[PDB]
Amino acid sequence: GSLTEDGLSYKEKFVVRSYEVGSNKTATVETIANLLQEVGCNHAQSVGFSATTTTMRKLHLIWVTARMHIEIYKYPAWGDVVEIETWCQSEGRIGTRRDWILKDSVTGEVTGRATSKWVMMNQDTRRLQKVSDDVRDEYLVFCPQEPRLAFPEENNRSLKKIPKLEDPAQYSMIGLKPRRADLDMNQHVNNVTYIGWVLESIPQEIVDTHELQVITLDYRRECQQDDVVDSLTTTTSNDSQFLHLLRLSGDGQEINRGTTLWRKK
Amino acid sequence: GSLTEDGLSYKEKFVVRSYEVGSNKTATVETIANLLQEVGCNHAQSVGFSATTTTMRKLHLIWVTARMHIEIYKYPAWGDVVEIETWCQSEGRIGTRRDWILKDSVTGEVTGRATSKWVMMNQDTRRLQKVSDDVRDEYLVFCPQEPRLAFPEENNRSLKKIPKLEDPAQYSMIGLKPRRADLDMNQHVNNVTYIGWVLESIPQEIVDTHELQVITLDYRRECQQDDVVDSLTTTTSDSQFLHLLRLSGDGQEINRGTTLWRKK
Ligand SMILES: Cc1ccc(C(N)=O)cn1
Ligand SMILES: Cc1ccc(C(N)=O)cn1
C-alpha cells in the first residue's frame, strides 16, 4: 500500500483468501468491512498517526464510528485482487468522514463504495463532543480541501434517517456473545462483529437466493466483552429491504440500528 | 506465493493486519491457523487440485482434519512479514500429513512450526476409511519421497495421546454457537473456530500473563451450523491445560486438546 501522488489519499491491493469467502466463492461483506478497516489503519500510519492527533492524546480523546454505509456492485472472487482507495474529510465541528472506493485490479472498474461518520469521544467518560479548532487544524493537512465524496448523489442512501424497529420483530437471533477473536487490540468488540450480528437474523433462504447490495449501520453504544446481544429484523419491502435492531439481551438497551437492501440473484 | 524449485513444497509471505492481532499487538493463534489453511489451499491449487484427487471426486471422498498441532516461539507483530513454507507427506494407509514452518521474513529465523493429520472420509455417509493404493499413487508425485518432518524429535508433543477431561471441569464457557463468519465456502464450521472455542474457557488472567506456546487439538465430530457447544478446561500442571468441547445438549464430544503456556 501507498499514499497517492498528492499525499491526500491511500491505496492498497488485497488478494481475497480461501477463508474470507462465502458459498458463492466471493468475499463476504464482513471480509470487505475488515479490508476497509485495514486500509484505513494503513492510511493513518502512513501520515504519522498512532488515528489520534497530538492534541487528542493530551485530552484523552479518540475517534469512534457513528455510522458505516457500504454498497457493493460485485463481490471479489477467491484469488482475485481488489484495490481500495481511502481518504478522510473534515465535516466542520460535527466530526470527520472516511470514504472508500473498491475496484477490480484487472479491469479497473468500480466494484463497491463505502462511507463512515466518526465522532470525537473522551476515552474515559465516554462523553461525545464537537471537534475543537486545534484538532481540526491538525488533521486538515492530510485531507483534500475541496469536497470529495464516495456518495455524491442528492438524496442518496448513505445519509437516510433509520427508524427504530417496533416489537414484535419478524425474525430474530438471540443470545449472541463475542469471543476473543471478535475483539480488537484494545479488547473492544471490533466494529465488523456488529455487521455479522445484524446479518445473523436474516433468514438463510434470503442469503441463499439474494445478493446483499447495501448495508447502513448506526452505532449507538458498544457491546462489552461480557454482554449478550439479540439481533432483530423485519422486512420493510425484485428487491428486498429489511429494518434491523441489535439490543442487549437483558434490559433491551439499543446498541445498533440499520437497514439492508438485497437483490434477487 | 509459489512452489519451491523442486516443486515439492510451497512458500507464501503475509503482512500481519491490524484486526489480526491481540492485546500485545502480535498475531493471535487463530490468525496463524487461518494463514496455515490459506497457504495449504494455495499449495493444493498450484499443483492442480480442485485437495481432492480425480479418484476421490468419483467415489465422493474428501480429506478431513483429525489433528492439528502448533508450536509458536514468536508471534509476528502487526505490520511484520511472516513467510510460511508447507508440504504434504503420505502416511501409508492411515492418511496424509501436512506440515508448516513459519519464519520472520527479515531475520530468516524459525518463529513457529505446525503439523496436521488428515483422514479420508466419504462426504455423504461421513464414514472414515483407509487410503487406497490408487489415491496414494496420485498424490505421491506432489510429496517429498524421503521423510521431511516439522517435528522430527523422538517422542515429541505432536504425537502424544490426549485423555478425556473428567467432570467437573475447573473452568467452562457454555453455549458457544457459530455465526455465518465461522463457516467456510461449503457452509461447514471452519477448523479454526474450534481453536477459538477451546481457548474461550481459559481464564482471561492466564491470557493476560502468559504466552501460548503449544496447542494440540483432536477433531472427533463436526459442530453443525445449528449446534451449541460447551468449552471445558482443567489445569494439569509453565502452565498446562486439558480441554474438551462437547455439544451442550447430549454432551457428545466434538474435540479434545491440550495447551502449554509460558509466563511472560
Ligand atoms: C455478502 C454477504 C452476505 C451475507 C452475509 C451474512 N453474514 O449473512 C455476509 N456477507
Ligand atoms: C496467541 C493467542 C492467545 C490466546 C488466544 C485466545 N483466543 O485466547 C488466541 N491467540
Side-chain angles (χ1 to χ4, degrees):
Chain A
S2 188
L3 285 169
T4 58
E5 191 86 306
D6 65 5
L8 300 178
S9 74
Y10 190 91
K11 289 172 175 187
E12 192 170 349
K13 295 179 185 177
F14 302 95
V15 172
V16 179
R17 298 171 182 174
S18 56
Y19 61 91
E20 284 177 343
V21 307
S23 75
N24 316 117
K25 293 189 200 304
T26 64
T28 65
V29 76
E30 289 182 78
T31 286
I32 296 302
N34 275 321
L35 300 190
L36 297 186
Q37 186 167 265
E38 175 65 359
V39 69
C41 289
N42 291 336
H43 180 202
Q45 194 171 316
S46 77
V47 297
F49 293 111
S50 209
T52 68
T53 77
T54 304
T55 294
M56 288 175 68
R57 294 187 222 101
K58 169 194 179 291
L59 307 161
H60 280 50
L61 303 175
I62 57 167
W63 290 116
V64 296
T65 308
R67 172 175 282 194
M68 171 63 57
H69 177 83
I70 305 174
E71 182 164 18
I72 307 299
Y73 310 123
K74 292 191 183 171
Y75 289 89
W78 167 27
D80 280 0
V81 180
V82 55
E83 184 173 66
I84 305 171
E85 183 176 15
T86 191
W87 66 94
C88 302
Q89 277 221 287
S90 158
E91 287 193 333
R93 302 185 91 106
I94 305 181
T96 58
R97 191 183 88 253
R98 174 169 290 278
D99 283 13
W100 299 255
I101 298 301
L102 293 91
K103 290 182 172 169
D104 179 272
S105 230
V106 179
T107 73
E109 84 178 34
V110 176
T111 60
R113 46 183 189 160
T115 184
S116 61
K117 305 288 213 184
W118 298 73
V119 292
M120 203 118 71
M121 188 184 75
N122 180 289
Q123 216 156 352
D124 308 309
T125 70
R126 264 68 234 271
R127 291 183 67 77
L128 300 170
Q129 69 174 67
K130 322 282 111 216
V131 180
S132 74
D133 293 347
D134 289 338
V135 176
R136 206 165 77 249
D137 296 338
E138 284 168 19
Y139 61 71
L140 257 158
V141 299
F142 307 112
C143 306
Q145 312 283 278
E146 307 145 28
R148 195 193 170 182
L149 289 106
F151 296 86
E153 308 93 18
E154 180 174 338
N155 301 114
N156 85 84
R157 314 185 154 119
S158 72
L159 303 169
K160 192 133 53 178
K161 191 68 184 291
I162 305 168
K164 193 173 182 180
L165 185 151
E166 294 168 346
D167 279 352
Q170 178 176 20
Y171 304 117
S172 75
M173 173 55 71
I174 310 305
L176 293 165
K177 304 190 292 199
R179 59 188 175 89
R180 294 199 185 98
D182 290 305
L183 305 180
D184 65 17
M185 62 184 87
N186 303 131
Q187 304 181 299
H188 282 269
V189 173
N190 189 301
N191 291 331
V192 183
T193 298
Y194 303 94
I195 295 174
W197 288 338
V198 159
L199 294 171
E200 270 307 285
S201 54
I202 294 274
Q204 187 68 44
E205 305 96 298
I206 288 294
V207 179
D208 290 341
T209 63
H210 293 72
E211 277 270 1
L212 176 65
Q213 261 218 284
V214 184
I215 179 173
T216 310
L217 194 54
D218 283 339
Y219 290 77
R220 191 183 199 93
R221 185 167 300 264
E222 74 182 338
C223 167
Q224 304 182 255
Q225 195 192 163
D226 64 342
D227 277 335
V228 180
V229 166
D230 292 354
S231 176
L232 308 187
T233 297
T234 296
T235 310
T236 53
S237 43
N238 298 22
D239 280 4
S240 290
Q241 302 180 56
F242 302 86
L243 181 60
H244 302 283
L245 172 73
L246 298 196
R247 70 188 182 197
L248 293 183
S249 96
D251 62 2
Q253 270 258 223
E254 176 181 349
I255 62 163
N256 295 82
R257 69 174 67 177
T259 61
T260 56
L261 170 63
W262 301 70
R263 173 173 208 95
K264 217 168 76 80
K265 280 171 185 179
Chain B
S2 188
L3 285 168
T4 58
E5 190 87 305
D6 65 5
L8 300 178
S9 74
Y10 190 89
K11 290 171 175 187
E12 192 171 349
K13 295 179 186 177
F14 303 95
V15 173
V16 179
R17 297 172 183 174
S18 57
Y19 61 91
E20 284 177 343
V21 307
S23 79
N24 317 118
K25 293 190 195 183
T26 64
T28 65
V29 76
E30 289 182 78
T31 286
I32 297 302
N34 276 319
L35 301 190
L36 298 186
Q37 299 185 320
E38 175 65 0
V39 69
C41 289
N42 291 336
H43 181 202
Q45 195 236 45
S46 77
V47 297
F49 292 111
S50 74
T52 68
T53 77
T54 298
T55 296
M56 286 173 61
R57 290 184 296 257
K58 290 306 221 95
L59 27 276
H60 285 211
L61 254 39
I62 56 169
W63 290 114
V64 80
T65 308
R67 173 131 150 172
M68 171 64 56
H69 177 82
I70 305 174
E71 294 195 17
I72 307 298
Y73 310 123
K74 291 191 184 180
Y75 289 89
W78 167 27
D80 280 0
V81 180
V82 55
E83 184 173 67
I84 305 171
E85 183 176 15
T86 192
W87 67 93
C88 301
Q89 277 221 287
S90 148
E91 288 193 333
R93 312 274 298 183
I94 307 181
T96 191
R97 191 183 87 253
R98 174 169 290 278
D99 283 13
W100 299 255
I101 298 300
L102 293 89
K103 290 182 172 167
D104 180 272
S105 231
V106 178
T107 73
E109 75 179 41
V110 175
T111 60
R113 48 183 185 157
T115 185
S116 60
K117 305 288 212 184
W118 298 73
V119 292
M120 291 241 55
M121 177 189 286
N122 179 292
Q123 74 206 23
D124 306 310
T125 71
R126 277 121 72 126
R127 292 182 66 77
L128 282 324
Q129 69 174 67
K130 307 215 293 185
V131 186
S132 73
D133 300 343
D134 198 313
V135 171
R136 181 157 50 86
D137 298 344
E138 290 182 28
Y139 63 74
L140 257 157
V141 298
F142 307 112
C143 306
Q145 312 283 278
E146 309 144 30
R148 194 193 170 182
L149 288 107
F151 296 86
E153 311 89 17
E154 268 158 319
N155 292 340
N156 74 264
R157 314 185 154 121
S158 71
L159 303 169
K160 191 138 52 180
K161 191 69 190 68
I162 305 168
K164 193 173 182 181
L165 184 151
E166 295 167 345
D167 277 355
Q170 177 176 20
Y171 304 117
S172 74
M173 173 55 72
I174 80 173
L176 293 164
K177 304 190 292 201
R179 60 188 175 87
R180 293 198 185 102
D182 291 304
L183 305 180
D184 66 17
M185 63 185 83
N186 303 131
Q187 305 180 299
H188 282 269
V189 173
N190 190 113
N191 291 332
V192 183
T193 298
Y194 303 93
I195 294 174
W197 288 338
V198 159
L199 294 171
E200 270 307 284
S201 55
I202 294 274
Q204 188 67 44
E205 22 280 87
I206 287 294
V207 179
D208 290 341
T209 63
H210 293 71
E211 277 270 1
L212 176 65
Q213 184 132 59
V214 184
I215 180 173
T216 310
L217 194 55
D218 283 339
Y219 290 77
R220 190 182 201 95
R221 183 168 301 265
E222 61 179 341
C223 166
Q224 303 181 256
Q225 195 191 163
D226 64 342
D227 278 335
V228 180
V229 166
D230 292 353
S231 176
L232 308 188
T233 297
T234 296
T235 310
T236 54
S237 43
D238 281 4
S239 291
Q240 302 180 56
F241 302 87
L242 181 60
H243 301 283
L244 173 72
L245 298 195
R246 71 187 181 198
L247 296 183
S248 292
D250 63 2
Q252 180 93 254
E253 176 181 349
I254 62 164
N255 295 82
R256 69 175 67 177
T258 61
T259 57
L260 169 63
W261 301 70
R262 170 226 173 96
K263 217 168 81 78
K264 279 171 185 179

